[PDB]
Structures are given as C-alpha cells and as structure tokens.
Amino acid sequence: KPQYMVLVPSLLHTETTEKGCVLLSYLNETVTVSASLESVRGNRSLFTDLEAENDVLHCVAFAVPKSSSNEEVMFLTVQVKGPTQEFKKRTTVMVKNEDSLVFVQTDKSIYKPGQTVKFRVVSMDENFHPLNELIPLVYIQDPKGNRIAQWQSFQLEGGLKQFSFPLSSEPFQGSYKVVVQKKSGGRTEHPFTVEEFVLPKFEVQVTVPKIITILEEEMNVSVCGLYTYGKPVPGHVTVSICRKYSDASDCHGEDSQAFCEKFSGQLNSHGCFYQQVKTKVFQLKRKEYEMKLHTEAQIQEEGTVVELTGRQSSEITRTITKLSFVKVDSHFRQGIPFFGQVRLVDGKGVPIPNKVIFIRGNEANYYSNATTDEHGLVQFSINTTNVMGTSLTVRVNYKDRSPCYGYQWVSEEHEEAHHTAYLVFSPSKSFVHLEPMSHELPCGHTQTVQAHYILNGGTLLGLKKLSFYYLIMAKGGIVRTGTHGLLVKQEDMKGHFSISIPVKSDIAPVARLLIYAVLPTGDVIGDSAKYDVENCLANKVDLSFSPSQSLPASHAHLRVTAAPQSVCALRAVDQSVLLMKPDAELSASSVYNLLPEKDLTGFPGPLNDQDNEDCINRHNVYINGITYTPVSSTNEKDMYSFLEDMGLKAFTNSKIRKPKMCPQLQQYTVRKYFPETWIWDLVVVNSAGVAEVGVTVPDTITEWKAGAFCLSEDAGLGISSTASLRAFQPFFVELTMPYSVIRGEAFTLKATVLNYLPKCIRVSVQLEASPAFLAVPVEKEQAPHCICANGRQTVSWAVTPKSLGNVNFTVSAEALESQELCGTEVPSVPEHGRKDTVIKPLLVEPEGLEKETTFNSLLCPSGGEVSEELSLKLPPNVVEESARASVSVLGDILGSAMQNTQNLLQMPYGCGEQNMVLFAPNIYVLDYLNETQQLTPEIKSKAIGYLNTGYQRQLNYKHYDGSYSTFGERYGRNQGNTWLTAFVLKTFAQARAYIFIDEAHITQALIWLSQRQKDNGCFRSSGSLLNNAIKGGVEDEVTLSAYITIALLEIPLTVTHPVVRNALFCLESAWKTAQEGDHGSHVYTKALLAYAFALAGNQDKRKEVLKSLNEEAVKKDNSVHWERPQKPKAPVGHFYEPQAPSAEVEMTSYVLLAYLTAQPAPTSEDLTSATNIVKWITKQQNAQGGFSSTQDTVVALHALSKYGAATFTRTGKAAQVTIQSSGTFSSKFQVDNNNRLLLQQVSLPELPGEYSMKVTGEGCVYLQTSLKYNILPEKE
Amino acid sequence: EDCINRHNVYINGITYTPVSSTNEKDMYSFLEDMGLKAFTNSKIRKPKM
Amino acid sequence: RTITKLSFVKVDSHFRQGIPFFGQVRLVDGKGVPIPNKVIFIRGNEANYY
Ligand SMILES: *[C@@H]1O[C@H](CO)[C@@H](O[C@@H]2O[C@H](CO)[C@@H](O[C@@H]3O[C@H](CO)[C@@H](O)[C@H](O)[C@@H]3O)[C@H](O)[C@H]2NC(C)=O)[C@H](O)[C@H]1NC(C)=O
Ligand SMILES: *[C@@H]1O[C@H](CO)[C@@H](O[C@@H]2O[C@H](CO)[C@@H](O)[C@H](O)[C@H]2NC(C)=O)[C@H](O)[C@H]1NC(C)=O
Ligand SMILES: *[C@@H]1O[C@H](CO)[C@@H](O)[C@H](O)[C@H]1NC(C)=O
Ligand SMILES: *[C@@H]1O[C@H](CO)[C@@H](O)[C@H](O)[C@H]1NC(C)=O
C-alpha cells in the first residue's frame, strides 16, 4: 500500500523551531507532505510543507509566532499530495504563546543593612539558544504589601542585566522579594531576606540517619563538620534530640514534643565528635511520630550558637523487607520471552547475600522459588499463552502483617512486589520487546543496547526486508531522527539487533525513545521507552581557579570554560554567611526543573483523543464456540497508546486503532576590603576560555562559593559549580563579639590569635583603641606563655561604643622572639607581614529606645492646589544624634490589591444565601478592578456570564411574590428574609449599575422592604438563616435597621423612594436609646449610625456620632481601626468565638465608610482616616480573596472602590508636589497614572520636621510620615 | 421586634408544647383586610415569636 | 479528664408553682476538697433566675 507516517511533538512552542519528523514508504514518492496549521475561526494558516522519497525519514523544522490569545486549540491537518492517491485527515493540537522561565539569584544568603541589593534574571525560548526580549517590569515588593525600588520597561541585549539598590543602614528587616512579571500577566517570585545577626567563623554539620527504621535499638549518630579551611576547631558539642507527638496537649502548659534525650560532649582535637544513642526509650511505635532534631555547638573563647534544621523527614517506616523491581518488562504477549532483572534490598539500603524468595504468576499460574545474588538481582523468565490479564506476585514471607494486625494499634508493615503489564492488541500478531539499559545514563558518551522483535509470517506478501526507525525525543520536541535495517530471512520472525545512539546533549533529561517499524500492509508497530538522561548541557561549563590563597594574598583569578562567544552569570562570595544559611534552587537541576513542561507527556486535560467510529455491533458476533458470546471492552496495550505516552502525533490509516465496537446500549600586608561581594560580574568566554582576575580579600578568613550560570546563541546554555577557596594565615588575630548592643550600653570582645603550624610561640594580642569606643583590658598583665597548634587562650575585656553607624574594630597580635621560657624554642619568624592587625565591621545604633512617632495627614488637588505644614517635633528628654524620620510618597490602590482583586472571581452553585455570596461580591470587585484601571474586557465578558447565571440562580431561590428566601421554589408557602433582601436590593443596585437589569426586580424588592412596616417599630430578622456569619452582624435590630438605611440610600442611578427615610427615623430612635446610654458595644452600632447619617447627610448628626467614635478610638500604630469590647460582657465560646462573627472588617469598613461621604466632597481629614483604616483593611486581608465573610468583603471592596471613585478620574493624572522647608532642604514630586505608585522612601536631617507640603494637579495621594528617635537620658 | 423567646419549648398550663404553632386571624390582619395603613402604639397584633 | 467536680447532694427532683425549691448544692473536687470561696454560676433556665 501507499504508506506515510507524520510525527509531530504535540504542543506548538513559538519563537523557535518546530522539528516534527515524518516518513514515507512503499508507494508514491512524487508526494507533498504538508502540515497545514489553521485557526479556522476567522482564519489562520501556518502551512508546513516538505517532499521526500519512499522508505526514508526526515524532519521539517518550521516554527510558530505569537498568537491571538495565549494558549489555543489547533487542528493541524496534514496534506500529502501524491500523483494517483489523495488523502486528508485532521486532528487537534495546542500552542501556548511561549511563557518563558525567568528568575533571580539574589546575591547571598543573609544580608545586613546599608547594602546594594544587586541581582539578575534570565529568559530563553524552547531551543535554549537564549532570547533577548522586552521586559514589562523589574521591581521589588516591600514586605508590607508595598514596594521599595524598581527598574522597568527595558529589554535584554546580552540576555541578562544586573542591578543595584543601596539599602539604608536603618531599613526594615525580614523577608524580601525581587518580583517580576512577563507581559501576558504571568508573574512569579524569588523571595529573600535581610535581618540582623552576628557572623560565623565556621560551619559544622551532623552525622545522623536520615533513615532509622522499626527494628532499631540505637542510632548511628555523630557530629562531624568543617572549619576555616576545613580545619579543626576546639569547643563543645550538643544535640537537640527529640521525638514528636506524645500525649501532651501542646496547650495549657504542654508541648507536642515526644521523647527527647540529652547528649553533649567535649570537642575532640582530631576529626569529628561522635555521640550515639539508644532507641527503646523512644517507643518507635504506632502513635509516637517522627523524629525532629537540631544540634548546636560552641566554639570556645567566642560563645557561638549553631542551629540547623535537617535530616528531619526520616523514614521511621512501617514496611520492612522493602524489595523492589528495577528492570520491568512493561508488557506481556503470547509469542515472546520477557524476563526482567529484579534486585532486592530494604531498610538501611544495602542487600543481603543469598536470601530466598517465592515466585508466582497467575493465569500463567506460575510457581517457583529463587534467592538473592550479591544484590538480589534475578532475571526470572515465563512462557506466555494465557488470558488477557497478567497479575504477578513474589514474596519471601506471606500475605499478612503476621504479628498482630487484628489489633489496629501497631507499627509495622511489609512490602508486596507489585507490577502490572498489558498486552499488545496486534491483529498482525507481531510486536517488539527490548532489553533497555533502564538505569543510570552517561552523557557525552554512548552505550549499545539490544532489543527483540518478531515478524508474523515475515513478509506475508510485502517485499524482502525492512528498516527499523526511531526518534530520539526531547522536551516534547525532537532532538534527533534515525533508522537502521538489514537483510531479513524470507518469512521468519528474527529478534537480534543492537543500537547505540548519541548522548552528547540537545535533548531533554529523558531518553524517551521509541524505535518502531512499519509495513506496506496497513500495519505498524513500535516499542516506547524511557530513561533517566541525567543532567547534560548543550554547553557543559565549569569554573575553576589556580589553587587558593592566604589572608593578604590579594592576587586571585578564575577559570571558566564555556561556549566560545558567550555571556554569563559569574558570582563569587565570602561564603561565611552563605555556608551559614543556604542559597535556594540553584543548580543544573534547577535550570532544568524550572522549565515548565518538564516532561511534556500525555494528552493534557482539555483534549481526550481521536474518536474512530469502528462499531462492530453485530446483533450476535459469531465468536464461534461451544457457546456463543457477545462483544466486550478490553484493557490491553496499544500503539496509539505508545505514541500517546510518547506525546507526539501522526495522521495515518494503518492498523492502530482496535475494533472497539461502539456502545450498543444493549440488544433485545593585609588591608581589609569589603566582603558582602567577592564577584558578581560578567567576563565573557572567547575561543580559548575566559579568565577573570578576582582579587582576594584580606583581614577575614572564611569560606567561598561560586554562583554561576551561562548563555549564548551558538552552543546553548550551561552550568558550572562551586569554587571554594578558604583563606588561611599562619598567624592571624581574630576578634569575635556580639552584634546587638548600642553606644548607650557596654559589652565585651574576646580576640583570639591562633597557631596551627609545628612551632609553639609566645605571643600576646593587643589593640589600638579608639574614641568611638572605650577599650581597656582585664588580664593583659597576664603573660600568655605560648600557643601551640590550635593554641588559643583568650583574656577578657569590657567596652562600650560612643560613635554611631558603620564603625569598625581592631585588635593586633604578633609572635615574639627571645623569651625561651614555655616552649622548647621561640624563633618567631612568620612572613615579613607576620603581624596581623585585622579591622572588622559593625553597625551600631544610638543609645536605648527608639519609639513610634507618626501622623496621618493628606490632601487632594481637585482642579487646584492643596498644601500643608506640620510638626514632627517633640524632643522632651532627647539625646544627641539619634532622631531620624521620614515621609514616603505614592498613591493607595495598587499597593496590595492585586491578589484578592483578580482572585475573587467566581461561578454559581448553591442556595440563595451562598448563591448570593457567589454572585454579588463579583460585582464589587468588578467595579474595584475597573476603577483601578488594570482590567481586561475578557474577565469583564466572562463576568457578564457570571452575572447572568448568578442572577438567574438567585431567582432559582426567590419568591413568587417578589421576595427572597434561601429556598424559594418547591416551597411555595413562605416568607423571605430581611437582611438577605437588604443585601439583594443593594447588590441589585450596583449590579444594574454595571450592566443591564430589569427594573421590576428592584421595584418589587424595594417595595417589599417598604411594606415590611407595621405602625412604628424597627423590625428584626425573620430568622430563617442557614448561617449566622454570612451576616457579620450581631442580630440587634439596631444595626440591622442601620443596614437597611444605608443599603437603601446608596441609590446608584435608580430611585429609593419611601422605604429608606423611616429607616433613618428608627435609626435616630435607636441612636437616642444608645447615646442617651453610653454602651452599644461602643464601636459597632454608633459607627453604623455614622455611615447611615452620612449617606443621609445628617451633617451635625453623622458628625456627632462619628466624633464620639473618634473619641472611642482603637487606632493602629500605623493606621486606625475600631473594635467591639473584645472581652465581651456576656460569656464567650471557644472556636473563633462562635455566635459572634466579630464583624470587624464589615464594621470598621462601616466605620471607614462614614467619612468618605459627601455628595460634592468631604474634608481631607476623611481621606487621611480613610487610607489609615484601609491600610488596616488590606492588612486584615488574606491570601485567598475577600475577607472572613461575604458582608465584610462586599462592603470593604465597595468602600475602597468609591474612595477611589472620589480620588480617581481618567484624565486626572497630574498631581504635582513640593515640600517647602526654610532650610534649603525640600523636595518636589509628581504623581500620575503610569508612575502611579512608587514609594519614595525619604528621610530628613533636622531634629524637628518643619517641612511645608504642597500638592497641585489631579488625583489624590497617600503619604505616611514618622520618626524614630531614642529616649531615656537618666530616669533615676 | 417583640419575641416570646425563652430558651425552651415554654408552654404553661396543662401541656408540654413548643409555642403552639397557630394559623388563625388577629387584628393586625384586620387592619390589612381593607387596604389601609395606620399607626398604633397599642397591642393589636398576636404574639408570634 | 473531668475536674472541678462539684456535686448535687440535697437536690430536688420536682418543682412547683407555690414553692421554693432550693438545691443545697455541694461542690468538691479531685483530692476531695473545694477551694475556699471559688465563685460560681447558678443558672436559672426559663426563669433565667441566674
Ligand atoms: C468603569 O468602566 C467604564 C467603561 O465605560 C469606565 O469609563 C467610563 O465610561 C463612561 C461612558 O459614558 C464615561 O462617560 C463619558 O462622559 C463624557 C462626558 O459626557 C463623554 O465625553 C465620554 O464619551 C463618556 O461618555 C466615563 O467618564 C468613564 N468613567 C467614569 C464612568 O467615571 C470607568 O472609568 C470605570 N470606572 C467605574 C465607573 O467604576
Ligand atoms: C571602619 O573601616 C572600614 C573599612 O575601611 C570602613 O568602611 C569603609 O571605609 C571607607 C574609607 O574611605 C569609606 O569611604 C566607606 O564609606 C566605608 N564603607 C561604607 C560605609 O561604604 C568603615 O567606615 C570604618 N568605620 C569607621 C567609621 O570607623
Ligand atoms: C502511486 O503512483 C502510481 C503511478 O501513478 C500509481 O500506479 C499508484 O496506484 C499510486 N499509489 C496508489 C494509488 O496506491
Ligand atoms: C483559510 O480557510 C481555508 C478553509 O479551507 C483554509 O483551507 C486555508 O488554509 C485558510 N487560510 C488561507 C490560506 O486562506
């Protein structure tokens, strides 16, 4: 027959080539294979085309561009235009606008203040020949839901960029994030840190099992670690040993920690420290959980704590005698030998010699026995001619937890070797098996493999011989293309053939091979494979260096060898504090897995398969036998499935799809230089390798690490690894100390000077004290006899600072001559710079207690200019040279309102209550996202869908009269709900306010609440709730009625006629009842009065109540907020204080909400307190979306939205600024729509703040000013 | 806003009975059955809780 | 688990509408002694005579 097979990796990755391979054979070489790649809706077409000869394989390396949308279904139709035969056949395929991988490697582990945060970032297309491409943004978010620095709107030219941002000496601390987004919305992170601490002069490490098991009475554990140049250190050791989850309550004075022993020790002078244990006391049993530990040790004369949390997730297991398979034979067939190596180990992880097994196969009803080789390896073999389902089993003991499994309270198990193999569906009666090398793979190498084939009747007619074809695949692409054959026998089923195929690079970290043959008879077979192609790079690369150096040995170098025209990441670190805490996600494996679509494998979610309409539904099948028998649905292996496993696709009419019938439905010398960076730069490799000239740092002996990454178009990327270069000085003075003291308070410093070489020498350290401190010793009059190797005796001291900032400290040692008293001799001839005088850094504060000193003031030019002056001036009991203050300048809607805003975007299921919770709040965030101006008409239109469906499903649960309950239909006789219906009228208001509604709904519901009116009273809930929290309130008609008046006065573009004023009337009534008293929870009811009177505009009355609230202040240290008693007069419950939603973000919003209201404008005091209480809002939000109810979420989002609707207008993006202080020290600023929110962290030199504001232009701004200044001169 | 709520079923007299769910005619509905509103401090409506 | 182990002693198993019924209600705990004057809560129910 005419035969063609057309192999295509089944996602279409853009901005790089697309190499799908293709075959022809046996008929019509005058043919034009062509993959037409069309988005028929409208009309795209990225035609692919090629011509070739019969019985050869070739590959068209076309490509794809950016697209209509991101990720899209693609019906790629292949066309093969022969001279006498036509053909046409479609499919479905996928294309995603390439969404790259980018990242950051921050400088170091753990940072001090005062430093330039420098970093980089990368991106590549699928062919990792990297890709210079435009960049939307390059910034950092400050921990508090805010930003501190930025780069923006550049593009890579070297495929890279490096940065810098000198941090202050008194900035914030904690966690930090250089966050970055890719233009199509995709954004992600690389967090990091800056804290304060004191440095290490070493690191050490545990010895311990990561795996202790059941049958254990002790634990091989010890303490072995490094030092300066990996040397020996003297000191003292200690473990933190502990089990988890004993019977204590972890509460009420109790701890979840289970057993915990105690083992300290001395530090030996050679090697490492060893302390082992017992493990009976621990009760390694049913419900005493895994072991979690640390171990920490001192270095003498320096007093160090060394915490490390590791070797922690250990396997105190249940299964012992844990064997496994290694060499599976994935499939079983009736005409083949399959026989897989099977090792066996367990537990600790080394095999026994010569331990027995038990062998079993079923239906093949096999039975046998074996024992272990050196590693248990056995290559058992079976004969096959049996029913369609294999199910194997092998043991050395029996099927049960034999001791005591019928007691439920044990700690044990044992394995069961389990493996399933399915069979080819081969009407050909031919197939292939392999002998793969299914274990560790060498690259830059190659290894030969055999495999085992067969031929049903050989060439039935066919022709003489065949070639067998294979694709070496990569990343759901194609790295290579190959084939091989040889002369056959005439009609025979041979099996011998070998293959070795290249392992250089250019391929994914799988060798997901399949080698397949095919015939002229509408027939095809091939055998998939899979391997761990361990890490291999298109350009391997390393760093190195001529051997390491000593303390003043400033001379240094590099040796990196990569692609010959190529740019790179080249770091180098004083790895003291990066051997303290690690880096994270940094290796060639990082470069790999950071790839999205690591193993592009199998059809994803959206697509199922091709559907072929083979329906073999005979009425009776004529399955000829002693009793007839109908059709069925199998479960066996297929070749369709081989390629679906592989991932790629083709377009052919061979024998692949089984005749699986269609469902019937049934039938009827040392100079200290700055550490904190040794390298981070770019030297570029020429055609003989690069050579950076590093330069070593003196006056500190510590550890070193190479941060690395590389790039170029020519050779593909690469990964080097760690240079480490630990310094050393045969005579060094080492000054150690705490880090956290102040000029106010004294402290001490213990400077040791060591010896490690065979001469023992008299030596006395000294200092050259300063005015910045005041240093005089404790035992200098002592005559230090001498120090031998690791000889270190250390006199005491005491000292305080006086100077402020990045001050330094000095000691000095020097070996001494001609005092032969202690040792056998004292020549004392180290190098010409024998004397070590090491100056080391430190950062001090001014004495005592800096405190909180802040204010909220704010203004907004509306067609004009607003300005202010104000005092940051209160020096009572001030001390010299300590105060330091600041404002910071930006707007207040983009700070931390990305996550929640785009998150809470939802779709309907449930009864009227949660039906509304899933419908309504989407409207407030719709407005909130639109008001910010960072929206999209797609979320909009799919939100039209949201709104229609959710609206309609609200009507699923409403009343036949107009009203609304939770249930509605099928419950005819009923009455709706009051607070519910208030919410529904409110949100009907706003939802019409965005899109079309019908007027009758608001009509009939507004008048429902209107008739909810007998003579006088303030009505209550018609209690039919299913949930007391959906209404955050506390059930009093007070705040209910106040909900009515606000929700019925906010009146967007409709009318609110009768119902709402008498709500104001009862509101005044309850106000009389309350304010005539003094307690209504003191925040909640009267704040609702505030916002009720506000959207009413009872100006004196709203003012009185919100002003009482202003007296009843619960404000925040950086903001404002209000709280119900929090120790409530009635007794409270246990879990979240039930029966009481606590309604803070709803009430505090309803506190926030009174101020913004005035139909022209309120005061700017309202805007100040608003951004205060909204700092509190956004801080009171959590990572999911919304807040702890639906009420608080709705009303928060709306408060925020209309705060904006006040402060936001499209063309109003022109807010200009100045300060005006008389000390020639002021500042001009500007704020707009596109420089719309950069924080301007800015400080001031004057003790007082007499800095007169000015603000002109369009749009409002949020500033926040405060001071830190120390106190406490004497306080006798 | 009136309510006859104590924490249990609460009928006195001669029977254990949660507040005996009735369906009959009182005078607030006899204000409804003509068509007018009015205002009244007095006790015209039944004690449903 | 149960601690703060008070006791009814001279309880009444009836109550009526022309009567005081007064539960001389013990309290002890644990080793078998009560605190000197640990304040408590006597809740009425449908009297809310707490
Ligand atoms: C929410 O989305 C709307 C999308 O339309 C944003 O734009 C608003 O659209 C209206 C359309 O009428 C603008 O009205 C304008 O009025 C002027 C003067 O009559 C006229 O010359 C324009 O052609 C236009 O009709 C409106 O100014 C504009 N902004 C609003 C409504 O404030 C809107 O910005 C987004 N914000 C909201 C409403 O949440
Ligand atoms: C202690 O010595 C160190 C190292 O010399 C000082 O650090 C730098 O010193 C140079 C001297 O010109 C200054 O220009 C730099 O600004 C210093 N580093 C910084 C802060 O970037 C350190 O300042 C000295 N401390 C004091 C004040 O005694
Ligand atoms: C291939 O081309 C030849 C010559 O036109 C023709 O005889 C043959 O039938 C073609 N392949 C088909 C139709 O199987
Ligand atoms: C447009 O649509 C037709 C539909 O048959 C398709 O064949 C063609 O490739 C598409 N693109 C072009 C080239 O117009």
Ligand SMILES: *[C@@H]1O[C@H](CO)[C@@H](O)[C@H](O)[C@H]1NC(C)=O
């Ligand atoms: C480890 O523990 C075993 C006992 O299980 C003990 O005999 C041995 O001396 C210890 N040391 C090592 C590393 O074998």
Ligand SMILES: *[C@@H]1O[C@H](CO)[C@@H](O)[C@H](O)[C@H]1NC(C)=O
């Ligand atoms: C294991 O099974 C084999 C049968 O294949 C039997 O000959 C042998 O005796 C059994 N095990 C022993 C006891 O060696």
Ligand SMILES: *[C@@H]1O[C@H](CO)[C@@H](O)[C@H](O)[C@H]1NC(C)=O
């Ligand atoms: C396995 O045993 C079966 C028993 O019928 C036999 O037909 C087949 O040839 C054997 N295969 C071998 C010898 O590997």
Ligand SMILES: *[C@@H]1O[C@H](CO)[C@@H](O)[C@H](O)[C@H]1NC(C)=O
């Ligand atoms: C009951 O009143 C007393 C004072 O008579 C008071 O000490 C106590 O706290 C109140 N309730 C309790 C037991 O908490």
